[PDB]
Amino acid sequence: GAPPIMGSSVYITVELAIAVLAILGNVLVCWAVWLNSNLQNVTNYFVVSLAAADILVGVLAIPFAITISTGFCAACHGCLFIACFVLVLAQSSIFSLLAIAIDRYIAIAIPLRYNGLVTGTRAAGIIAICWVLSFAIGLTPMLGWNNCGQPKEGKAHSQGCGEGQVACLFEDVVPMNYMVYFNFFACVLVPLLLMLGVYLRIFAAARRQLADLEDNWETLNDNLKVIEKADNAAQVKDALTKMRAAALDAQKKDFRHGFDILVGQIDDALKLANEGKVKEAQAAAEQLKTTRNAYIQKYLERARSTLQKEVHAAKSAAIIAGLFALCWLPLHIINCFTFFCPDCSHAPLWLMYLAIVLSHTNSVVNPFIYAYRIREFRQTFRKIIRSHVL
Numbered sequence: 131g132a133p134p135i136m137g138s139s140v141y142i143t144v145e146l147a148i149a150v151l152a153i154l155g156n157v158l159v160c161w162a163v164w165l166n167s168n169l170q171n172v173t174n175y176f177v178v179s180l181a182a183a184d185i186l187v188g189v190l191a192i193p194f195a196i197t198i199s200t201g202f203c204a205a206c207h208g209c210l211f212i213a214c215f216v217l218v219l220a221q222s223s224i225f226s227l228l229a230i231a232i233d234r235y236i237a238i239a240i241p242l243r244y245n246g247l248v249t250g251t252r253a254a255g256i257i258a259i260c261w262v263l264s265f266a267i268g269l270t271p272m273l274g275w276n277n278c279g280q281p282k283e284g285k286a287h288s289q290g291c292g293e294g295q296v297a298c299l300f301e302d303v304v305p306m307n308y309m310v311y312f313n314f315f316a317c318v319l320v321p322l323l324l325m326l327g328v329y330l331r332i333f334a335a336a337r338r339q340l341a342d343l344e345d346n347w348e349t350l351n352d353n354l355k356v357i358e359k360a361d362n363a364a365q366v367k368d369a370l371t372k373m374r375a376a377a378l379d380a381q382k383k384d385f386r387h388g389f390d391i392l393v394g395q396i397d398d399a400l401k402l403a404n405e406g407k408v409k410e411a412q413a414a415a416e417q418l419k420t421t422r423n424a425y426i427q428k429y430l431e432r433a434r435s436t437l438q439k440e441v442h443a444a445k446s447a448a449i450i451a452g453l454f455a456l457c458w459l460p461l462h463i464i465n466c467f468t469f470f471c472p473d474c475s476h477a478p479l480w481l482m483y484l485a486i487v488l489s490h491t492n493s494v495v496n497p498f499i500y501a502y503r504i505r506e507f508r509q510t511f512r513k514i515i516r517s518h519v520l
């Protein structure tokens with residue numbers, strides 16, 4: 131049996147190395163939001179509420195993890211705070227993720243009423259409510275759902291613990307039924323499943339909007355080409371009416387003239403054919419071709435350009451929410467095993483160290499996703515390096 135101090139120096143070093151990277155990267159995000167006003171919006175106010183949770187991980191949660199690793203003697207309730215504080219920071223992070231997904235869903239689904247729903251002051255109050263709920267969910271064991279009533283007297287005397295003190299160990303103070311049913315299934319697994327469902331509606335609604343533009347465009351141009359080889363005066367009344375319903379369906383100030391000019395030329399062709407004049411109406415329809423291929427077609431590509439921009443942000447936020455579940459599921463399934471298969475042997479200590487270290491890594495990857503995926507966060511970052519390194 132090798133001395134345990136050697137088998138722990140690499141653990142403390144990895145925990146301290148991750149803590150330093152968690153404090154620097156996330157503070158840099160909070161510094162860019164305060165500096166650039168373009169980064170000040172409802173979406174990023176939830177990013178700061180998440181970066182603040184990642185900062186406190188490397189400031190308090192990681193020092194708490196190194197402390198409990200020793201099993202030091204302390205009051206049973208004082209040990210509960212050191213063991214369950216990371217649950218508070220993990221709860222608000224889930225709330226920030228679920229809040230960002232809802233905000234992006236409103237932007238793509240209801241863009242006309244987005245400015246009326248979300249507000250700088252309405253989002254700030256949601257953050258405060260989420261932080262209060264995260265303390266309630268995270269500190270549930272301190273309200274009596276703990277193992278203080280049945281302390282392990284054999285280990286208390288072993289660490290030389292005084293009267294009333296116990297060996298601060300997570301599995302000995304936090305019940306497993308709380309970690310698996312109340313924390314994992316209810317407060318972690320269920321919220322993540324909703325995030326998966328909200329993101330499916332976002333990408334599906336975006337695809338539906340793209341299909342309308344192409345379908346509304348197909349109904350526009352292909353219907354006008356029908357009248358170029360027409361037969362009766364009513365045969366063009368159908369095709370011009372098909373383009374009229376598609377002109378308004380696609381309209382849903384640079385295009386304000388563009389549609390008013392094109393729809394006006396359309397109505398000046400129904401009546402021209404409403405009187406039997408088929409050849410005179412087709413001549414007025416070539417005037418639509420200029421409008422179609424000059425003053426309106428730029429809108430269908432600008433609207434298509436904005437949709438692709440908005441979806442790109444939905445992927446960037448979904449990548450972050452996906453990386454959160456990846457870093458936290460291994461720890462939760464280990465608990466599931468210890469709780470569901472008692473005949474099984476408990477997971478070895480070296481695997482417990484990998485699951486905990488992996489769960490702390492989540493507090494480091496988020497500042498990297500903002501840069502590599504958001505252009506404005508990159509440039510604001512770079513201005514901080516240039517205006518600080520010198």
Ligand SMILES: CCn1c(=O)c2c(nc(/C=C\c3ccc(OC)c(O)c3)n2C)n(CC)c1=O
Pocket residue numbers: 141195198199200213216217300301461465482483486
């Ligand atoms: C809520 C997240 N969480 C756990 O899930 C958890 C846990 N500790 C255990 C099991 C024991 C353990 C683990 C590592 C050790 O040395 C470093 C050790 O000596 C014992 N678990 C299961 N902790 C970290 C203290 C925790 O905060």
Ligand SMILES: CCCCCCCC/C=C\CCCCCCCC(=O)O
Pocket residue numbers: 146149150188189193196197200202
């Ligand atoms: C950037 C990292 C900031 C945190 C640095 C501090 C890390 C260590 C924190 C407290 C360790 C727990 C204190 C326990 C007292 C000694 C235990 C013992 O001697 O048996």
Ligand code: NA
Pocket residue numbers: 183184187223492493
């Ligand atoms: Na986190």
